[PDB]
């Protein structure tokens, strides 16, 4: 019930590396959601106007916190202001269960209304860098990193990237507009995969270009038109291989991001074919939810 | 584009989903895409009069949801223009290879197009899918399945209708429009029927869900004859004991098992005689359906 939040927050969050602006379209959208039918009901009848307590956010489960910054965003924007922090963890952190990520006070009555949107954001993107944390595990041992994409859920794609990168992923591009990435369609509505790689870097010479191959064939053009970095779809792990040694003979400098049929099993065969990259949709459109939750004194 | 067509308009109506909420999320889905930009790949690599026709066909099987939101998508990016050959409803079952949708429209209308869709396909049918595969386990039993307010921010009127399409049940949709009685009340309240009298107190027509950790509890407001109570983390052991007391007692309180639930015991949660499961991980942990948007 407030029109934006303090400055206070918005340094908190690009303090953390958070769009304030997006964070502010989820937060107030968030918490329309639950506002819009009426007041809190339930909390109206059953606890004082003048009711302050304590509240600690916990995990049930071991992972990594991400989204702390955006739920005290929540909890300033419903307050107020009128909150104090006593405790608080980093996003990034691991947690296991009982571990205390945040410990703050305010009125009884505004925790109540915030909790779940607080919660709902803080177990989701927790899930995220939780299941991006453990992709990045079964890549130890190797030089292979775990990208996310653009398979976002609707509203919280720079928010789930955000979470991607506290799990130690590394971000793929934002939109259609601020990197190439030449799909099998392109290649279906147009000619062969090389002319399309030679046509983009014609026509956008400046953004970063990577073309999207599904057979060892297209990966023979790409490679000899000198391709920047090529990603494998469906390729299977001896494929892979393959691809890693036809790579291996004509340009060094072309990295081979592998995607699709990915799993976390099968992450570790992947990453010990010398590809370079991962690329895990998975990462932000199945990401199960972290267990958090908040309780009072 | 500005809105859309009112022909999408009334479809999204004639499904039941929030036609207002829809446009957010889906202006709100292409503005993350397009803020960058105009789709360079597309613009170097694809004729600006080509015309292609695409479908939509799932690699796994499941429920079917939200395909009047992806055609409104396809609607704005078009202003119109498109034209739809075949189109499966939501809620039906679909497998492998199994095409939800076949459009014809302006090939670079299509590719900015085909990730939001498809974004908003797989999240929604995956919504539906783990929904019926709880409903299954709880077949041959006289318990139904219900949501949360556990939703991903911004989307709960489409997960909720996503849940419907699945075969589940909705609990409230907000803060306002149903009493629950939770954790923090009571800590708040002092008692847990303290706080159930004081609800029925406030608003008589109401009703009141009381929630529940011990079985304690639940003797307290079934001798308040509370009119539903949900027992939140009861073991499977636990609820059977439940529903037992509230057989005893000669008010017939409605009882919603809720926490922790898993499709894991799903079905085993389902027998102990409660009448109700509310699972969060219907919406919070609902894994993608895989549908894929392929060209001629
Ligand atoms: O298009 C992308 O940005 C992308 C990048 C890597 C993996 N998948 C995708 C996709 O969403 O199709
Ligand atoms: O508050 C709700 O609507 C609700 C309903 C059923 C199960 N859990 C919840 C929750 O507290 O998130
Ligand atoms: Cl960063
Ligand atoms: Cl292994
Ligand atoms: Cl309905
Ligand atoms: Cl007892
Ligand atoms: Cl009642």
Redesign the pocket.
């Given at each position: 019930i407030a029109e934006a939040w303090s400055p206070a927050t918005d340094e908190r969050l690009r303090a953390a590396g958070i769009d304030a602006e997006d964070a502010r379209r989820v937060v107030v959208t968030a918490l329309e959601e639950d506002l819009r039918y009426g007041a809190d009901v339930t909390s109206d009848a059953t606890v004082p106007a003048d009711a302050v307590t304590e509240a600690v956010v916990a995990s049930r489960q071991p992972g990594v916190l991400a989204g702390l910054p955006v739920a005290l965003a929540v909890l300033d924007l419903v307050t107020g202001g009128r909150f104090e922090v006593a405790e608080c963890r980093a996003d990034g952190d691991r947690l296991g269960p009982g571990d205390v990520a945040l410990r703050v006070t305010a009125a009884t009555r505004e925790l109540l209304v915030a909790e779940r949107t607080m919660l709902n954001l803080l177990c989701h993107l927790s899930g995220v860098a939780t299941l991006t944390a453990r992709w990045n595990d079964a890549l130890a041992g190797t030089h292979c990193k775990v990208?996310?994409?653009?398979?976002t859920l609707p509203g919280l794609r720079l928010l789930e990237k955000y979470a991607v990168r506290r799990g130690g992923g590394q971000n793929?591009?934002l939109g259609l507009g601020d990197?190439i990435?030449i799909?099998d369609n392109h290649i279906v509505a147009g000619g062969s995969a090389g002319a399309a790689l030679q046509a983009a870097r014609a026509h956008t010479p400046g953004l970063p270009c990577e073309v999207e191959v599904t057979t060892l064939a297209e990966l023979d053009e790409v490679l000899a038109l000198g391709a920047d970095e090529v990603?494998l779809d469906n390729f299977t792990v001896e494929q892979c291989v393959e691809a890693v040694r036809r790579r291996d003979a004509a340009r060094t400098r072309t990295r081979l991001?592998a995607?699709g049929g990915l799993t976390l099993d099968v992450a570790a065969a992947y990453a010990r074919t010398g590809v370079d990259l991962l690329?895990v949709?998975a990462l932000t459109h199945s990401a199960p939810a972290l267990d958090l939750g908040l309780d009072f004194a």
């Open positions: 990208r996310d994409s653009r398979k793929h591009r990197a990435l799909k990603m991001e995607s690329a949709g």
